[model samples]
Target chain A: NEDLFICIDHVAYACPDADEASKYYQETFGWHELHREENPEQGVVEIMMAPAAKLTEHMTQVQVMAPLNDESTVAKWLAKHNGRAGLHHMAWRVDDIDAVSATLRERGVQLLYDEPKLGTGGNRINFMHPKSGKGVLIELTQYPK
Target chain B: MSNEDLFICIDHVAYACPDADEASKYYQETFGWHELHREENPEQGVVEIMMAPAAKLTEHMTQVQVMAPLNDESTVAKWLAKHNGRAGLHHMAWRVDDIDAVSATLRERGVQLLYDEPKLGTGGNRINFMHPKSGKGVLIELTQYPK
Candidate 1:
């Protein structure tokens, strides 16, 4: 069914230092440093890591993100957790982003925005407000087939 | 070639719940997750209900462990208090090839283990937890399946 949740896309962690976090995982666990992308306007840096296997096979990745400025959302989240690193969100793959968002929206699920948008990694993504996901931030992602 | 990392894959994501049975049902109805197993440990003062993705999509069978505390003084109760009664992500577990070897390696790297020795965890697995401080604020569990 289109409304059913699919595989996990990735798990994101908010960190004070993205580079340092990436280095820690890479050196300690042998996870590959997949890529790093900096969004100047958003005031955030994103570092993606994964096992040295095909992403298609793994079906999940770990993202380490840090705020470039003190006013960024990541910074606010860090403050909420008492300046501790923590899980930011988990993204689940879906067959149709539009359909899922519509269903969730109708069910009174508070989505981050009114619609899905292209997110990092070129995937159409939408975030379900934490209140709707039992206090865990949830993201719905639809990757190009 | 086998990956050199001691951690193989994510075994499950554990969420602290006030009632595991209710949480499992809610998740299943909301997200199509299927209940896989349930275990109650009276000695531990917790009930664990495991759920997974539909069998057709077995590629992501990573289970979700809904943990309900049966006593006020249990670790699950402490976790619930820490999160203010909200059912939320508590910990992520990773499968390990050898728990003892991994424990030794982590100690050598100055990583602090919550227990000095691996303990019997749910599903007959030898498990140990890493302090959240060492896990970047995420409580991490390492589990070894029985041979």
Candidate 2:
């Protein structure tokens, strides 16, 4: 049905260094590289590593992934965020992208962008107003299936 | 349409701790959150610092993250030059109960994915990311915790 919001979809991380960080994760833990991409926009070839038998029940996770771009936006973000690493934002998965987006607009949730944008997984995505999301950048993604 | 569950459960969050040991010490000494698990994926060259909720988060408010060293000096050096050796979050994580279903939905919507399928991650969770370009500068990760 339309106008429904679900649970979380995924959490995203940005990195200034892809190669070194990838090596760092691999060396530190046995976590294996799940995926890697050459994205020039963010400025670094990115890689994702995960744990063994990754699908577990009700788990909280994090990916120390890297970015491709040199002098990335994350660099600027780091400066402003005070260099302390922590939860950046909380996300939710919605069943109806357009409707929930409209509802959020009516509810007056602060939106980072004027409209929902296409996200990495090829879905309509929008950010909650940072103020509304409790100072963290809240991403609202359409439920995957 | 039905209203989807808002506070389903814990998602993924990352920390950019410059020194994993230091970060662990802070958590252990300050909060008493014992280390749950630690692993490394040589492909990424990162050392992960992980901890679990000291107890169930009744307030539904907490911080979760995986930290990493800023890239090379040339790349991340700018951050260090100004930031004083601080680590930051790469991105945040969320929970998706059904991996394949969520994957198809996002793919159909044309979201640029960090990965097409859910892959293995720390603690044996299947995870994926949404390209930041598509989702603004913020990177997103989705995980399916095995039952």
Candidate 3:
């Protein structure tokens, strides 16, 4: 089931300013403020949220106000993409990295990484091309920590 | 630090899709969201679906949606053509106290304004657009919650 059923737990949207985005989410949609954390690992600040007091651990988050370090996935996207906002990338929670990724690759999905890489929140992450799943890029992650 | 320095929150996000029903279904299944509102803007010839955020990941996420096929056609449709059937995001909106203030600052930056003045949108908010031509081709919107 790990192979076919990947749990998509989160979606990370890179914004030019996290604080501004945070305010937008609050005043407009009434999403409750969850927390704020500066991810030194990615050189960004994230303003996490849950819609109107509905708090959950893995709630929706808007990652913003981060300097895009060269050679990172965010930087690459910033380059080719027009800032007009939309879906960033959908993330899936996987239990096993090696086995799941290998199996998925055999199914003809484009794997961006040679192996699992560390992502924010200390999880192993990999990416798939937008061409594979209805033109939206998909990410596979595993929480071993 | 001033009060403005603090993190406020997400307002909503407007994304484009081929059909509202399909888009609504996907969001419903994945995020436990349901369409809270729907409308057909004949001027834009686009339909919209707004699914309320169900989970934390969906907090600030609301689709500022526009669908295909109408007489006049929406600028969003132009975006879809430019991107070639590939889905394009319509806008990211923030709730603001003063729409004029936000639009002023953005305009000073030479950002193009979609409307000369704020107009009514879903949820009784006054909304205006920051043209994508001025900002990374991403439509940035500032909405003021109506009193």
Candidate 4:
């Protein structure tokens, strides 16, 4: 049926201080902080927040990410955004990223790389480039089985 | 999708651009997304088209919302201008079972609501937003289907 995506995996929010935002989400909204890790390559400290600490089938997550340092892209994004925090890029879950990548290229969609690249959570991931401001960034993620 | 503790899931991720049709076309023809719904909120001066990767939605699946300014009066047009007429993520909407109940709880927690009451939204759902809450760069919309 050509349905390439499974579901919305997570919507990433980049901020100056990820934990501070997480506190707001936790102490206020009561969103469960499911996982936390420092993605050194991406230069961000990321936490996966959900309606509950345990995810249900097809549940979505809010990825609260903080800048690891001033030199990272996460930090620069915060600076460009006037240090305001909000949705950065959203990720969609996929079963086969390589196959989906092929289909997208054939359809002339621009991607960040020629092949699937793994990062952060060991899930093979790639980004659909934000060619225009109207075209926001989309990350394709294929989690390990 | 069944776990509707507070929020159901991300109902949709909105993208703002100059032309909704143009952006939607790419999603359908290239990205293989299906147009789930389309509507124009004349009161709000914006057109909204919903797209999803699957033609048939599974519970909790999120859709992409393509938004265009109906005219200069549209807030999207000003948002577009702020972005120098480029495309970007506009906001993320969370689906809820009871908008009023959730709204009240969030309010009790010191969260601010942009409007005092929920208004009619896409697909006949009740909706509301947060008030520049926390200086975070993102805008969030709360939507609930009439049960």
Candidate 5:
């Protein structure tokens, strides 16, 4: 009911190539490469980047994502936008995802999944429909204990 | 230098829309985020409301910036039109301690910046942008706050 989100988990940037994007963040922006994973279900590869030496508690990171193939949602999204890279979505960190999902539904929020799905870093994740998030795709993430 | 050595943390993710007040209200009543600051940047032709999970910011906290056009000619208005008048994520601003030093380092790394020099930005901070092409498709903002 209160403080549904602990902090912003990460902002996802959809690009044509995840490797190149992550490298740019590191070499150009001087961001720290923190983590990387490929999600077969989502058909995309994602790399997490931190701003400084290492991630401190609750520090936000950047998620650089690229499609694995043409069938990927990310690939389709890129095609729709004429292959321009952009910020795709932002995730909010929550302590309890189920409770938060219930609360959001009660508040007229619509989620993309009926239940949380396993996401990168083995986190439980669900997405708020763009319409429910006021046109921004919002992901709710809970790290596994 | 090994690394340019700035970027303390993600400062804010900006959301550009047609109505910041309404968006701010939704964030409060629905998501339970606290509105920490509100100001209109006439130079930028937009109104912004900074929101965070807590009433006050914690060290390394990242805030969500809700922005709406102040006039038809505002870039926010143009951005919205480009997206079919839909609200969405705009840009990511990284906080830095020294803008001039970081700008020089980034340029040396083959990054193209929008400005020849840092310009006044939100809260009187020195701010500049990395050209989207240089960012590989995303626009990035670099900001250094006054001491």
Candidate 6:
């Protein structure tokens, strides 16, 4: 009764410092830092990491993000978590973002972003609020098809 | 040059719950996830179930693992009490090729593990948890499957 959704794209974590948070995973779990970037439009700084190779048929990346400025959205999210590092959101890839959004809306689910927006990895993404996702912040993403 | 990597894949996301059955039903109905496995450990005072969206449909992916505490002495029960009865993400497990090597590496790096030894976890895997405090508030599990 719904469109097909693929595997998880990435799970993001909110940290005070992306580099500092990334070291823990890199040193302990052996994930390699892929890249680090600061996006003014997103108002966040993020460090992307991945396993040595794709562990599954579908890949799932990890990102450690922090607010670029004090008034950024990442800062507010961090504040909500009591300024502690924690899970920020998990993103899953889908065939069509609009189709998925339509279905979720029909099911009375509230989306954090009113419309799909370009996000990291050059994918269109929208987030489902925790209130709608049973306390888990879920992101729906669509790659170029 | 690639260094020695411990994690192979994301095993599953563990959620702490007051009722594993209820959570399983909710996810099955809401997200089209189907139950894959269920187990109870009296000694650990916990019951858990694993579920995934269209389990047979996906070739490579992880499942969601939900567990409920059976008694007040259960760690899940303690966590639930601290979080005001709210069901929350408990931990994320990553598959490892060698549990012993991973454990020793983490130990050498001064990471605090919740248990002194890896124990059998869901899906019959050897698992150990890293303390949340040491893991930036995220409980991480390192798991090794039978070869």
State which candidate has the highest DockQ. Answer: 5
Q: How much lDDT does each candidate structure score?
A: 0.79, 0.53, 0.58, 0.83, 0.89, 0.78
Superposed Cα deviation of residue B23, candidate 1 (Å): 1.7
Model 6, position B123, has a per-residue lDDT of 68
Q: Which stretches of candidate 4 lie over 4 Å from their true place?
A: A132-134, B1-4
Please tell me which predicted candidate would have the highest lDDT against the true structure. 5
Model 6 per-residue lDDT at B31? 54
Q: Check candidate 1 and list the clashing pairs.
A: none
Q: Write the per-residue lDDT of candidate 6 for residues A38-136, one digit (tens) a residue.
A: 898778999878875444556567789999887888998888778898877777778888987887777666888888998776789888777566666
Per-residue lDDT tens digits for candidate 1, residues B76-147, read: 988898888877888888778899998897788778889999999876899999888788788889889888
Worst ten-residue run, lDDT, model 3 chain A?
A1-10
Q: Can you tell me the DockQ of model 3?
A: 0.14
Ranked by DockQ, the better of candidates 4 and 5 is 5
What TM-score goes with each of the models?
A: 0.91, 0.45, 0.58, 0.93, 0.96, 0.88
lDDT of 2 by residue, A4-96 (tens): 333334444545555655564344323356666665776545454544325333332334434344376555655565442223444555667
What's the lDDT for residue B122 in model 6? 66
Flag clash pairs in model 4.
Answer: A85-B137, A133-B86, A133-B87, A133-B88, A134-B86, A134-B87
The 10-residue segment with the lowest total lDDT in model 3 chain B: B1-10
Error of 5 at A111 (Å): 1.0
Candidate 1 chain A: worst-modelled 10 consecutive residues by lDDT: A51-60
Of candidate 4 chain A, the 10-residue stretch with the lowest lDDT total is A128-137
C-alpha lDDT of candidate 2 relative to the true structure: 0.53
Candidate 5 lDDT, tens digit per residue, B73-105?
999999999889999999999899999988887
lDDT of 3 by residue, B15-102 (tens): 5666667767755554345456777777767777765533233433433343444432576667667767676444556556778776
Tens digits of per-residue lDDT for model 5, A64-139: 8899999999999999988989899999999999999989888888889989998877799999878888889999
Model 6 earns a TM-score of: 0.88
